[PDB]
Every structure is written in C-alpha cells, then in structure tokens.
Design a protein around this ligand. Structure first.
Ligand code: AP5
Length: 186
C-alpha cells in the first residue's frame, strides 16, 4: 500500500489538504494528533499524560505515537489502498522507527508555510475552536519545536529523494492543485 508522509509546521495546512486528498483519491487519513486526542478523550491515565504534554506543546514519545499509528493502520488495513500519515514523523528517529516496524514511504508532502502565517492561523483557530494548545505561548513553543526537530526530517527524506514541496501560503485549492500534481505523478 501507498504510504504518504505529510509533514509541515503547526497550522501549515496538513489536515486541510489531507481531507481534500481523501475526498478525491480515497486514501486513508491518519492523524497522529487525532489519535492522541482520542486517547485523551478516553479518560485513561495515559490520556492525562498525553494531554499534559500536548498542552505544553512538546513531542509525545515515539513509542506511544508510533504504536497508535501502526494500530490505526492495521485497523483500516482491509479498506485502504493508500495511507496519508498526517503529522508523523516529527523527528528523524520517528521516520527511522516507522521504516523498521511498518514500511518505507512512497512520498513526503512537505506543506510549507511561513512562520508568521502559521502563528496567524493558529491564533485564529484558537479564538474559535478553543483547542488547548492554540494559546499564544504554546504556539510559540510548537513553532520552535518544529524548526528544531522536524525540519531535519525534511532533510532526511530529501536525501531519500521523495520530498515534494507545496506552497501552503496560497489559497487552499491552489495548494491542493500542487498536492494533486504530486500524487498524480506517483
Ligand atoms: N508525530 C508526533 N510526535 C510527537 N508528538 C506529536 C506527534 N504528532 C502530534 N503530536 C502532538 O499533538 C500535538 C498536535 O499535533 P497535530 O494534531 O498533528 O497538529 P499540529 O501539527 O500542531 O497543527 P494543526 O493540526 O493544528 O494544523 P494543520 O497543519 O493540520 O493545518 P490545519 O488545516 O488543520 O489548520 C490550519 C489553519 O489554518 C486554515 N488553513 C489551512 N490552509 C489554509 C490556507 N491555504 N489558507 C488560509 N487558511 C488555511 C485552516 O482552516 C486552519 O484554520 C502536537 O503538538 C504534539 O504535542
């Protein structure tokens, strides 16, 4: 099955673009973020641990998040001809462990947005949906964390040869025209 990594900063537009991809190509959208939040909503002690980490805007340990990705992948396994892995990997070791335990990605969609643009979007979603990590201080924390840990992931897969960059400063469906182009050329 096709495994696509979709990687980019906070509020760059990963989720948005992934759901457009689902609607058009019928890939299976797996959000590490959605998976983690669902474990939070479960009421477990683990959820309490994950909620604390996410509220501070830090990386959840590789073991937890890779576990959930693999689980979800295995569940949707008999209906998926493709997978969109949204927001994983976020550090080089995550990409390495994914490859050891699951498989190699066909493509990495690099959803590229300016830092200020990302702050603007998250600041807006913060005032509307009231996601706990969208407060101003946590945003700065998520943004710095993206620059330090997740950018080398982009380098890693550029060395692999599979990164395609899309300009996420554009209007949403102009962005998606780029995503479509990258996916069509598989
Ligand atoms: N692998 C991992 N390892 C360790 N920890 C992990 C982990 N994965 C998750 N975690 C933990 O989970 C937490 C949250 O991670 P996660 O849930 O993955 O989210 P995020 O990366 O912090 O960012 P968002 O999902 O909020 O934004 P987005 O890039 O998907 O864009 P979106 O379309 O949704 O929304 C963007 C906003 O802008 C709008 N928008 C989108 N595109 C455009 C456009 N072209 N023009 C105008 N507006 C746009 C959107 O409507 C929206 O309002 C992490 O902080 C971490 O603590």
């Amino acid at each position: 099955a096709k495994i696509i990594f979709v990687v980019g900063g906070p509020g760059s537009g990963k989720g948005t673009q992934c759901e457009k991809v689902v609607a058009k190509y019928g890939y299976t959208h797996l959000s590490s973020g959605d998976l983690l939040r669902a474990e939070v909503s479960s009421g477990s002690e683990r959820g309490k641990q994950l909620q604390a980490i996410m509220q501070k805007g830090e990386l959840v340990p590789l073991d937890t998040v890779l576990d959930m990705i693999k689980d979800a992948m295995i569940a949707k396994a008999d209906v998926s001809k493709g997978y969109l892995i949204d927001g994983y990997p976020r550090e080089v070791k995550q990409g390495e462990e994914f490859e050891k335990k699951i498989g190699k990605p066909c493509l990495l969609l690099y959803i590229d947005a300016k830092g200020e643009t990302m702050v603007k979007r998250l600041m807006k979603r913060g005032e509307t949906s009231g996601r706990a990590d969208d407060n101003e201080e946590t945003i700065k924390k998520r943004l710095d964390l993206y620059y330090k840990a997740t950018e080398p992931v982009i380098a890693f897969y550029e060395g692999r040869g599979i990164v395609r960059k899309v300009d996420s400063e554009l209007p949403v469906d102009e962005v998606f025209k780029q995503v479509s182009t990258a996916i069509d050329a598989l």
